Amino acid sequence: VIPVNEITNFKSRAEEFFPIEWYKDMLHHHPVYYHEQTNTWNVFTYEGVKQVLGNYEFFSSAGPRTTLTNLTLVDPPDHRKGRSLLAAAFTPRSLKNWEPRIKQIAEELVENIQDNNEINIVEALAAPLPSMVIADLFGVPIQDRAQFKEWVDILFQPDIELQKQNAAKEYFQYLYPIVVQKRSNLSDDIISDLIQAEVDGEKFTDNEIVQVTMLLLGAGVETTSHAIANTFYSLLYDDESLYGELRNDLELVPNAVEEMLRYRFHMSRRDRTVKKDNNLLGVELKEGDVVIAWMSACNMDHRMFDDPFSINIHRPNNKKHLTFGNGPHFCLGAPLARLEMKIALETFVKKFSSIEPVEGFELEKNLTASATGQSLTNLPMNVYK
Template sequence: MSNPIISLSEMTDFQSKEDEFSPHHWYRRMLKQDPVVYNEASDSWHVFGYDLVKTVLNDHEHFSSERKRTIVNVGYISEDDNNNEGEHHIPDRLDIHNVDPPEHRKRRSLLAKAFTPRSLRLWEPRIQALAEQLIAKFAHQPVVDIVEAYTSVFPVMIMSDLLGVPSKDHHLFKEWVNQLFLPSTHTTFAEINEMKRTAGEEYFKYLYPIVVAKRLNPGEDIISDLIRAEVDGDQFSDEEIVRTTMFILGAGVETTSILLANSFYAMLYDQPGVYAELRNNPELIPNAVEEMLRYRFNISKMDRMVKKDNNLLGIDLKKGDAIVAWMSAANVDERVFEDPFTFNIHRSNNNKQLAFGYGTHFCLGAPLARLEAKIALSTFVQTFSRIENVEGFILEDNLIPAAAGQSLGHLPLKLYT
């Protein structure tokens, strides 16, 4: 049987961490030369063009989410998981990622109410207060590591709060997320899987008593929402809820942390004049967030399995083939975005970016991520008149591996009030 993990390193062959962090040259080449290509080393097809990516993500009759191989190695495989086919720790009744419609719609609806506009309006004051609280801690420092002090802490505190667990323990959640979402290759799989198993067991032991207590006294949080939810007259078990929150926490922390860190990098190094523009025109921030997602969120991709033979992408695909849709490459497709390799917060159509996916599996947490990014940036630019990069910063030395790709481990900057 083929390996359950599709190793992207065998497809990309980047020569440095910086190449992976800023893969625009590679995306440009693939879009022009190989918009659909088979990679023998990973035994998988890869799709880069905008319209082709949308087809893969939206046509669940031909491209299924019920796959045997995946690029996302989340959680761990335990010794009793005999079929050894990827992630086994999201309860079936709450797994919205590895299922197709119509079952997908039923499961998604159980989680969707936590991310409605009404819920976001209720959460907005809490998110705003957390941004102000974190900024106050470093507001008078001349230099700050914005990743360590802000962008890596902000999302985990928000998710801890929204799940309904003590925010004082947010550092524990960050450590667990870092380990549970670690990427692995064929050679490192066993070692990293053991690290993930340890982190998963620690997380379970911590959260299980909290879920039990909330069942007796539910509040206004995601865990309580899951406790109240019913499927065909059945409620979720405490274990199912714990396992589901592990995924929600990870998905809500990892991607938003990277988006925020990359946003500051873009304002320091891609277009240094953007910060002053946002400071003077904060109404531009929502559009700036969309451009960050399009241009600087270079790590967005999803995998599918070919459900039936077809040539919808212009090549013959066979049932069972693994296929990876590179949304971040689609986001720099010049057939959709004019001058795509330029960072431009005034771009009129950057809301067409596919960073959060497309179709039935569009990211459930996208509205929350956008809200967090808007508040994080707005609160920051209102506090500081300008920022500057720190001399001697070497990008290659400050990148660390994450589930989605290389991410910033540190980003020092100068602050001016």
Template structure:
């Protein structure tokens, strides 16, 4: 069996075995906040924090908790080049991030809004006449991957290949099958690189209005990025750009059906409620965690942490910390501070794609709400039959819902 020493296995820390528990880890989060808010996992030599203030400190304080790390829970094969915003800290990280940030400015996103709207219109129009739709397969998966493909300047007809590669790259490792999964990831990464490389070469010769073209012209430390550095940046954006947004859109509909049934009618009556729903879903139903490496010996959280150890901030738990969010276990879109969740991270590594993900989610919801008068669960729905293993534990691979046309 290939060594797993550089890969942290989250489910071995939580010990959550069943699909149901991995889909809903929130009872375990609560137990850890109350009984083990700072928890050392001796098997993997990993510290874990579950409270809001602790998680925020880990994310913000790069001098104490560095993103330069030898081990990680990120399941994507590690490739470090000058354009990689992972595994780096300020000031180096700031230069790398600036290369990609121009694509996600408010002005850039404003230009993209009508294009995203047109894609959402087409996907929702295709549902016309159906009484049952699979919101994951028909909206949550295709919308983000089409958008990020267009944003990058990659042929949108290749979206199924892109999605397949992304799924493999983000699939979590397991100890028993580590070698097989690592081989699959290496193969997917190689195919992805070979697919993008000629596209990048063409962009360098004939730039267009897209991110890959911008990256071929970008300047880092007085030099242009190599073609392979542009390729690797593209893979990072294509993968991350659809994974989180697919989960957000899927979870929005799940929350409207099961976390607060009936709230769909509020969305129809008041469009200003939609961004609030998006933020509450991000707070309430995202079991996400981020790792850092302890950069120096510290007792900042009351325990002796040694330089070189890994620490995990469980943001999905921090987002339900009662000291930050009153009645945190209740789904409430009118919570005054729900946008202070940590799902997109915090500090220098705050997710670059967060504004795009929010825009896509709001457009997807508003477009759907205009077309359909109501939604209901299908009879006999069992969530465990619709889950697939993902980097965060379990996520929805399908969500059939009954719809009524407006």
């Protein structure tokens, strides 16, 4: 495993939460940057990251160093089978029917919020929504969602390591009978979709489906909670006028969501192992070289995004950011995350006329380590009707 912390070498939690100064330095002085201590190549330009992520002919996901069942360590010469099987659960049809179910879960969370005093938007919406939503789309029976939610909070929400292997044991032992039941009772959920999915005649087995669900929870529960929490932090400490714009016209939420993914999702970075000699990045890369594509950095590249260090929900090409990746490994749950963010934002802005930060908030005292870097543990705010 690659210790990415040595490449950045931050000396504070708040800097890692929004590494805007490091992004500037690396975009300006080290577009392609070899790090001697980790033996890794680091790319920050939009064109460079797009090459690394998309061009599978030269950059492989299968590699010793990392930062039909596991489609994240496989390349297109075999990736299509696992990709197509998993894509059958995320068709435009399923996404269309998930809007009222996700919208309904968000109503309970927003209707529960009353002002009176300061609220914690992380515990009240940012953290519970992805967990409650993914339990719904999995088809977990309603009477077990509490226990399911508890496992997900231990696994993917920030001795601790022994508590996690007991959660993994309980998860696999509980969900395997569920997958067996659903094969004889096809409902309208993801597990039922993974069962009947067929590619090249092959299908998933019961044991393979349980692993796949564990891959989806790890891929779109914490990252979605992070994006929702950062969206509210930006609505509080970045552009003050943005909230009033969203409430004047609710139709601007999709643009606001897409701009939060470009500007306020840190940090985004995936590795690729070089499979063929080339100088496609401006340096001579040999086979076996590890290249880290920094996407949260390339979303600030002025060669692609005009005025990149400012928030602008009217920038016409905000959707071409690389927070969801590029190429064959493009995020399969990207439309779901976009729907979750829009619904959580729409339902919130429709209720409250204005929001205001809290007096004594210190960013450094409310951050914890996470997969992307640093995540808000809580986010106090005052809300008004």
